[PDB]
Amino acid sequence: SNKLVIEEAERSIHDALCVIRCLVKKRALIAGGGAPEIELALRLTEYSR
Amino acid sequence: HVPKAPGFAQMLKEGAKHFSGLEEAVYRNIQACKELAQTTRTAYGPNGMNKMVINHLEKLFVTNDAATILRELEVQHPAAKMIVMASHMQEQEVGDGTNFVLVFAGALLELAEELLRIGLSVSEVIEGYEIACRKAHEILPNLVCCSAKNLRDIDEVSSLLRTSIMSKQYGNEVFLAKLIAQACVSIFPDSGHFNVDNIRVCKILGSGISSSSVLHGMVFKKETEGDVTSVKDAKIAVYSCPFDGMITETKGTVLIKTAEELMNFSKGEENLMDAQVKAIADTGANVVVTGGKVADMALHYANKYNIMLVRLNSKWDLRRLCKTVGATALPRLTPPVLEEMGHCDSVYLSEVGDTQVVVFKHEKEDGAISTIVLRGSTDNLMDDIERAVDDGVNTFKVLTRDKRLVPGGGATEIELAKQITSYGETCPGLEQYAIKKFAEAFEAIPRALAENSGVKANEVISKLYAVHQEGNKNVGLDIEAEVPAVKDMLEAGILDTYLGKYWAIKLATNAAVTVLRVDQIIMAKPA
Amino acid sequence: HRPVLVLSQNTKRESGRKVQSGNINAAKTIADIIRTCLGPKSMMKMLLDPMGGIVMTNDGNAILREIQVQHPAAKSMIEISRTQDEEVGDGTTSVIILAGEMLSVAEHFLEQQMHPTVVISAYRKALDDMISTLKKISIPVDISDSDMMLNIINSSITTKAISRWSSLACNIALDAVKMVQFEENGRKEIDIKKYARVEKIPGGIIEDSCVLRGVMINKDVTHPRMRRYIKNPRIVLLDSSLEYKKGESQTDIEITREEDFTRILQMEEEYIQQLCEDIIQLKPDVVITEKGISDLAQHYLMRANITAIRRVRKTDNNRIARACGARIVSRPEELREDDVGTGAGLLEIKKIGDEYFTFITDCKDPKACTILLRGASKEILSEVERNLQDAMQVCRNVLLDPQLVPGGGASEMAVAHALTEKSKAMTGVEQWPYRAVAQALEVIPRTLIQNCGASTIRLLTSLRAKHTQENCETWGVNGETGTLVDMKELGIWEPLAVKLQTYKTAVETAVLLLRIDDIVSGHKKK
Amino acid sequence: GPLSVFGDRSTGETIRSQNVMAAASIANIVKSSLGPVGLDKMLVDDIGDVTITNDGATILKLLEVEHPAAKVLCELADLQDKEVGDGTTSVVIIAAELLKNADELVKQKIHPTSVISGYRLACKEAVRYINENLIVNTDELGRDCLINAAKTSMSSKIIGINGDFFANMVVDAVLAIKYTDIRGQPRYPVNSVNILKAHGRSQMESMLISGYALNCVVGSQGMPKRIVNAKIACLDFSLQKTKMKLGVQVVITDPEKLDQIRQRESDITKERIQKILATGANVILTTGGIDDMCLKYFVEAGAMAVRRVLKRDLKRIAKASGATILSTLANLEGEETFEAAMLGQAEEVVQERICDDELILIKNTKARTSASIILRGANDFMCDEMERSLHDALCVVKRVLESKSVVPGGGAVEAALSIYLENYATSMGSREQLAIAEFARSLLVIPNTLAVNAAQDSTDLVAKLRAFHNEAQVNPERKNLKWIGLDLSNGKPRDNKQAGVFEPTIVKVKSLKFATEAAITILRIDDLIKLHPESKD
């Protein structure tokens, strides 16, 4: 509807095509939404001890 | 190349302008006074709106009264000052109806422009307005239906004062009518001259208007400098001299010649001040109020003989205290007071609204003077209620001068518009057009009441002439709700200032005539 | 220096009563400027131009075009008088006074808390009833009569400055339109601007001014051997040049031999003699072109007894093509017998004030004429030129619409009583603005007595009583004396196209300026 | 420590309050020009040009803005002209009130993504409800639907008369340019109607020229200006002298061959003008240029030649008169053939008087019978207003004839959506129900603005408006109160079905889709960084 929404929709589509681009190089995925940052915080705390 | 037009016959000014004729002088004076009529048209009536007016002193004035607005506006047009000074004469004469002058004379000059541009010059519009003005003073004694004569007490004047209150304080029409009834009737001179200066307003910042009251006495804004603040006998000795002793006038010089006169001078001055304070303590005095300063030796014996001291720095407030408690200001130092003592009921102190005040409250002998203590949330609100209080005191002086009243709220101006139109149709001359335009100026006065209420003024002004068929003469305007279906004014009780209507028609006619006499304007360079 | 976080920078905002009642005072201000230029007792208004010239006139269109205003609603009223100047001739000053009065009564209803769309809807209903009233009081005109057409053009120039020479200016303006009334195909047209040229020459008297039966130009002969007085010339009009110019190419000639350079200089002389031999096959007398004529072309036309004019303008060639009946050709080798201007009368190269003027007059039936104005100076000759333009256009409206309306106040009072009697069946809130349109038409008989100094009370009361009866209905205001004379005896008659354009433009000016409640000023564009 | 940017950074609820005041600065301008009681404005430039208009697109395009949230609403009005064409004051007021009510939600610590997701559930339900509560298509009403929809668009402008003069000229113009397409598409291209302006007589003398009205002159004053049974020759090449190109030069070695080349530049030029004129062609239209040498051949043969016409005007004439737009010579290595069977046809080509200008008219064109409208006004300010009001009126009848569906105007759609979305927010609303409830109050500003500009009762007329629409949804007794609108001339709710207040469906569907999408972008400016202007380095 505006010229500002198309520039954001162009970057959001490129951010969506790059997600599937990472799945071609490495066929592996993890849980999102703050999931691996907690596991990197607990396992490296036990590694530091 | 391009030429220009030089001076012709009398271009001798050094920066001043000049106006001559009807289009350059007369028509421009009308359009300048029309802008003042359209300015205060919104603030006219009970449904009028306030105006935050800031003067050159950078302070705030918010009010709906047209008299106090024009005093702050720095008007510079010369013909516009004539309608301001005509409204200022309405405040000095009766104190109410100052805005009635701006609507009527603003419509008189506006309809005069329709006559100069279609017809007669100023020699016949002025003479036509003067005939209808003399006939307007013959209908006003015929429109009197009620009178403020029977039962001159706090019950009848509580309803006769609501019209001057509801025009500026619409929601507080019941509280301010009872506060002006317990103050104006209580200072009655027993069929004498009603002084409007005997009612003071003590603005105390604090709670809302529901906590306001009227105290029979005076309330000051000063301290005691003592510890005798509880006085129940209240025998007041009022003085105007500074309460510090008796000093000479020319130079003043203590002349010591021996060691005995130096040692006895300090002790002799304390014994001289001790004999003067105990001379008024044996007479039964309790409150000693002075005008000037007070030394430390006078405060020492004031607390010793248990008498209260009051400092009044204003010389005008000292004369009002003499009429409050019934005393006399003595210019000399403290004598034995024979019969010029004051007699109040209770003089105490209380901190109301974080303000320590001194109250000369009368309990038994209630009527000597009155002071309305107003409360408000802002200082700007208390100034607007004080203008509504002063409009209630000025209306009480009108009823003392003339007890007649006319039904307001639009009922008087329609009957004045009908009778002048009857005189205009029976005049076989060329000046009958100005008589018909004089009655249409009365038609625009209930038009401003309907435009401020959100009602269409075309349907409002059509129902007024339809119910005025030669025998009613009382139906005004019902601005309580939309789709009016207007009612009677005597049943509602909307009638005020017959003497106010007698002067506001006369002042606005002479103001509009004086503008039309101006044919040539010679102004100077403003500096 | 941090910028201020604003929106719509350096522009103004204004709405409410200051724009509705502000555009009325801008319309009343322009109507008071030209208020003393409507009746026959009017006065001139001397104006000053930024070029250094002086425009001394009393016409309402020429005054408002010389005024530069800054108010936006004041710029609308100037374009109203420009529209009335192009449609009709003498329909200028009356619209600006009427649109100022229709907005004067419109300001009264805006103070009564009435919506502006109610006044415009009452103005459009009143506009449709003013057109039907003028068509009932009209009168058919015999356009074949000469004395009837002289009374129409005399009524339009009585206000102007040529009312003193009324017996001469009426015969000039009538003969100017009747000559240029040309009809080739099945369509009648009158072009009084491209074919009826009004040329002014300083000197002489105004009584010697007359419309020539033909055209005239300020051009001398190219050679003194050429004749300056031909009885019946055969005029051939050209458009191209009689010279040798470079072609529209990149032509370059390589000269290697000795005889090549002298041959090109001889072929330039033979090319001019070839096109000069092609124009003498029809045996002409006058050759008129728009571009230059070389001296080699002047030599061949000298011994052939041909008078040649050099640099006649393109607008003058289109005007002489209608007078002599010639064809403006642009190829000398494509000349025909129909392209020769036969039927032309006397041709004479006169001199008026140390300057030669080529006169082509005395034609048989010319379709274009030139009005020769001669006066004291160029100042008053611009007045007669602007008055004859207002005198030829009012004759064009009668020849396209032969209906007359009784002017001089009788036109406005005949409709103001028709709007008053029709307003009795309204019975609504639009009844009172419908009555104000009939009262706004009173400003045209108000102006005719304020200019002559008569009373506006004793006369308008008697004039309104004359239209109470349906029999007379044509009583107007006599601007000469100041009494009420019937227009059937005076002879003041205005055309239908003048009075219809006056009422249609004054209402729609009030339609546009009443719907304006906001003004934004301070922005730029490309 | 902080950010070392050379510009300006403002976070928090500062920009969240500035974008609402930026949108309200635009909405408070155009609120006085909505509905039949709306009033026009004045647009004065710095150079002195005055533009009197009331359309929401012409005002916001000429008005300069600075705020980034202000350029969203100004470009929102420009999209309404191309997509719909009259829907371009109502979108700006809705999109600004969508931000005003969402600002009250984010001040209650409600997350704006729930307001964005709450607006999408209310926008898609508003299109679903308006497509299931239409009255009838264009079969029952017939020609009364096209006239009543045209008068609704003209009521906000200068051509809103009580009669049907301007309404009948618009319907007769769109119905005369019915251009069929493949797969059954009766297209109505409204850009082919040449809208001309001339300061002349009143608005009741606006001619409806059945054909085309060319805005050009004849040129040479020796040609017949009226040709009956004319044959139009539409061509686009300059009829000037034969000038050689850059690659071709004239290098002569013989002085005797000089004059034959000079005459050849006009002989090849006049060879084209004699083979296009011997085929019966009387009217020649040219987008290039016809010089003074070639104008003689039309005066001699008695033909009309119009030079320097627009390329957009030549395509409208050649398609409507059956002419072929020819640029050069063609047809399989032919010298000069011109394909004389492909000439145009016309009943009458006549140059009339248009108040001191020249205007060429073509009558009925004998092939397609197109239409052109010549407007008549008082001054040039009214003619620019009459052109914009007529172009918005042509876009209304275009969408009705294409999409045969109309909705009741005058606030009848916004009253029904204000109550259906409140019941829709109660059924499936857990946390986004406050955004759907504020979507209904934002839609109520369209009947609220009609009561302000009419100086009528505000909080009582709209309260009486939704009283009929509430009984039409909760009392299924066939009350038929879905078409209750506003009578701004009287101040009472009326029935828009019998009153003839009709609007197209996509003037409100595309309005609610563009205003909701624009309100999402301005709702995500919680952080804003403004850099310094890089002008002088």
Ligand SMILES: Nc1ncnc2c1ncn2[C@@H]1O[C@H](COP(=O)(O)OP(=O)(O)O)[C@@H](O)[C@H]1O
């Ligand atoms: N209860 C009421 N009903 C109708 N009209 C009222 C009522 N009370 C006051 N008014 C009107 O309000 C107006 C107020 O006028 P005001 O401004 O007080 O005049 P002035 O400025 O001379 O004091 C009066 O003219 C009166 O008619």
Ligand SMILES: Nc1ncnc2c1ncn2[C@@H]1O[C@H](COP(=O)(O)OP(=O)(O)O)[C@@H](O)[C@H]1O
């Ligand atoms: N002899 C006369 N008696 C009365 N009225 C006259 C006479 N001559 C002219 N008038 C009036 O003077 C007016 C002049 O109008 P004018 O300013 O010429 O209009 P425009 O500006 O359109 O040319 C006319 O409307 C006409 O009625």
Ligand SMILES: Nc1ncnc2c1ncn2[C@@H]1O[C@H](COP(=O)(O)OP(=O)(O)O)[C@@H](O)[C@H]1O
């Ligand atoms: N006769 C009428 N009665 C009630 N409302 C009307 C009438 N005519 C028009 N309207 C209203 O006036 C509004 C005008 O909107 P408009 O400014 O034309 O939108 P846009 O700017 O998109 O063209 C419409 O929404 C319509 O509801």
Ligand SMILES: [Mg+2]
């Ligand atoms: Mg009062």
Ligand SMILES: [Mg+2]
């Ligand atoms: Mg004239």
